[PDB]
Amino acid sequence: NRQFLSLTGVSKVQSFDPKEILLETIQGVLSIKGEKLGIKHLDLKAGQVEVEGLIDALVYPLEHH
Amino acid sequence: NRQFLSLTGVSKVQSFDPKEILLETIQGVLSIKGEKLGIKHLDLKAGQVEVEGLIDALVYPLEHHHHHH
């Protein structure tokens, strides 16, 4: 059930481990939680990030949850 | 400020409007809210979707009562 998620407009990877990825973007922080997560690609110049893994939840902007 | 979001494991587009897209995926529904949103690509064989626009929020899994029933 592995999924690949790609997003632009990302300004920074705040933190990453296989259970959670925190990304900083336009309206705040995006939280991706799950298991076996991994950063597949990152290009801050282009504001591009690619993530893969077993996704349980996606929350954005994290400050409103 | 326009963002591009692509996701795999998508089985169905529940509903689409330039301000909200509801997609059915593995654990339930993913809600993408914002403005001038558009679905640029949808391939159900591959389970792939590509969305673009101004994203204000992403909630997954969405609350059952907020699905488009």
mmCIF file of N, CA, C and O in Angstrom, chain B residues 35-58:
data_model
loop_
_atom_site.group_PDB
_atom_site.id
_atom_site.type_symbol
_atom_site.label_atom_id
_atom_site.label_comp_id
_atom_site.label_asym_id
_atom_site.label_seq_id
_atom_site.Cartn_x
_atom_site.Cartn_y
_atom_site.Cartn_z
ATOM 1 N N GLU B 35 -8.185 27.590 -3.627
ATOM 2 C CA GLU B 35 -8.871 28.282 -4.693
ATOM 3 C C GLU B 35 -8.151 28.074 -6.007
ATOM 4 O O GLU B 35 -6.954 27.750 -6.031
ATOM 5 N N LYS B 36 -8.906 28.232 -7.089
ATOM 6 C CA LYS B 36 -8.415 28.026 -8.434
ATOM 7 C C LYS B 36 -7.734 26.670 -8.520
ATOM 8 O O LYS B 36 -6.686 26.527 -9.140
ATOM 9 N N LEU B 37 -8.342 25.674 -7.881
ATOM 10 C CA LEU B 37 -7.805 24.321 -7.917
ATOM 11 C C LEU B 37 -8.257 23.667 -9.210
ATOM 12 O O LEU B 37 -9.325 23.996 -9.743
ATOM 13 N N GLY B 38 -7.447 22.743 -9.710
ATOM 14 C CA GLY B 38 -7.809 22.040 -10.925
ATOM 15 C C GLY B 38 -7.217 20.650 -10.934
ATOM 16 O O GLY B 38 -6.129 20.427 -10.387
ATOM 17 N N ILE B 39 -7.934 19.698 -11.518
ATOM 18 C CA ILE B 39 -7.386 18.358 -11.631
ATOM 19 C C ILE B 39 -6.713 18.367 -12.997
ATOM 20 O O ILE B 39 -7.357 18.623 -14.019
ATOM 21 N N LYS B 40 -5.412 18.104 -13.012
ATOM 22 C CA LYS B 40 -4.654 18.131 -14.255
ATOM 23 C C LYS B 40 -4.484 16.754 -14.853
ATOM 24 O O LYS B 40 -4.307 16.620 -16.060
ATOM 25 N N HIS B 41 -4.554 15.726 -14.016
ATOM 26 C CA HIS B 41 -4.372 14.366 -14.496
ATOM 27 C C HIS B 41 -5.028 13.354 -13.560
ATOM 28 O O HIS B 41 -4.930 13.483 -12.333
ATOM 29 N N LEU B 42 -5.697 12.355 -14.135
ATOM 30 C CA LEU B 42 -6.296 11.288 -13.348
ATOM 31 C C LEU B 42 -6.225 9.981 -14.135
ATOM 32 O O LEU B 42 -6.853 9.835 -15.194
ATOM 33 N N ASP B 43 -5.460 9.030 -13.613
ATOM 34 C CA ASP B 43 -5.314 7.735 -14.264
ATOM 35 C C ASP B 43 -5.610 6.663 -13.223
ATOM 36 O O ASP B 43 -4.757 6.341 -12.396
ATOM 37 N N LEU B 44 -6.828 6.124 -13.262
ATOM 38 C CA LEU B 44 -7.260 5.110 -12.299
ATOM 39 C C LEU B 44 -6.541 3.759 -12.407
ATOM 40 O O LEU B 44 -6.532 2.977 -11.452
ATOM 41 N N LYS B 45 -5.953 3.466 -13.564
ATOM 42 C CA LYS B 45 -5.211 2.214 -13.721
ATOM 43 C C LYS B 45 -3.959 2.335 -12.865
ATOM 44 O O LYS B 45 -3.555 1.383 -12.181
ATOM 45 N N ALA B 46 -3.356 3.522 -12.910
ATOM 46 C CA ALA B 46 -2.148 3.791 -12.145
ATOM 47 C C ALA B 46 -2.454 4.313 -10.742
ATOM 48 O O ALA B 46 -1.582 4.329 -9.879
ATOM 49 N N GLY B 47 -3.704 4.713 -10.514
ATOM 50 C CA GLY B 47 -4.097 5.256 -9.223
ATOM 51 C C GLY B 47 -3.455 6.610 -8.975
ATOM 52 O O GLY B 47 -3.297 7.040 -7.835
ATOM 53 N N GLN B 48 -3.116 7.291 -10.061
ATOM 54 C CA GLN B 48 -2.430 8.574 -10.011
ATOM 55 C C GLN B 48 -3.309 9.812 -10.257
ATOM 56 O O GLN B 48 -4.128 9.832 -11.178
ATOM 57 N N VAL B 49 -3.143 10.836 -9.422
ATOM 58 C CA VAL B 49 -3.849 12.098 -9.617
ATOM 59 C C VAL B 49 -2.844 13.242 -9.536
ATOM 60 O O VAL B 49 -1.851 13.153 -8.807
ATOM 61 N N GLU B 50 -3.102 14.303 -10.289
ATOM 62 C CA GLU B 50 -2.271 15.489 -10.253
ATOM 63 C C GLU B 50 -3.218 16.658 -10.089
ATOM 64 O O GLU B 50 -4.160 16.813 -10.859
ATOM 65 N N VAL B 51 -2.962 17.474 -9.081
ATOM 66 C CA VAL B 51 -3.793 18.632 -8.790
ATOM 67 C C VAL B 51 -2.925 19.877 -8.785
ATOM 68 O O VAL B 51 -1.740 19.799 -8.468
ATOM 69 N N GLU B 52 -3.495 21.022 -9.147
ATOM 70 C CA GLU B 52 -2.735 22.266 -9.118
ATOM 71 C C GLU B 52 -3.638 23.404 -8.678
ATOM 72 O O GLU B 52 -4.849 23.385 -8.930
ATOM 73 N N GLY B 53 -3.050 24.388 -8.008
ATOM 74 C CA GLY B 53 -3.814 25.546 -7.582
ATOM 75 C C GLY B 53 -3.281 26.162 -6.308
ATOM 76 O O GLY B 53 -2.135 25.919 -5.913
ATOM 77 N N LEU B 54 -4.114 26.974 -5.670
ATOM 78 C CA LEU B 54 -3.752 27.633 -4.420
ATOM 79 C C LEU B 54 -4.334 26.778 -3.300
ATOM 80 O O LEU B 54 -5.550 26.718 -3.120
ATOM 81 N N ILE B 55 -3.468 26.074 -2.579
ATOM 82 C CA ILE B 55 -3.915 25.187 -1.506
ATOM 83 C C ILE B 55 -3.937 25.857 -0.134
ATOM 84 O O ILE B 55 -2.927 26.388 0.323
ATOM 85 N N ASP B 56 -5.111 25.850 0.497
ATOM 86 C CA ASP B 56 -5.306 26.433 1.820
ATOM 87 C C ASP B 56 -5.238 25.348 2.885
ATOM 88 O O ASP B 56 -4.804 25.598 4.005
ATOM 89 N N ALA B 57 -5.681 24.142 2.544
ATOM 90 C CA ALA B 57 -5.736 23.068 3.526
ATOM 91 C C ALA B 57 -5.763 21.665 2.938
ATOM 92 O O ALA B 57 -6.206 21.456 1.802
ATOM 93 N N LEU B 58 -5.266 20.712 3.721
ATOM 94 C CA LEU B 58 -5.277 19.303 3.337
ATOM 95 C C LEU B 58 -5.656 18.552 4.595
ATOM 96 O O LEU B 58 -5.014 18.728 5.632
#
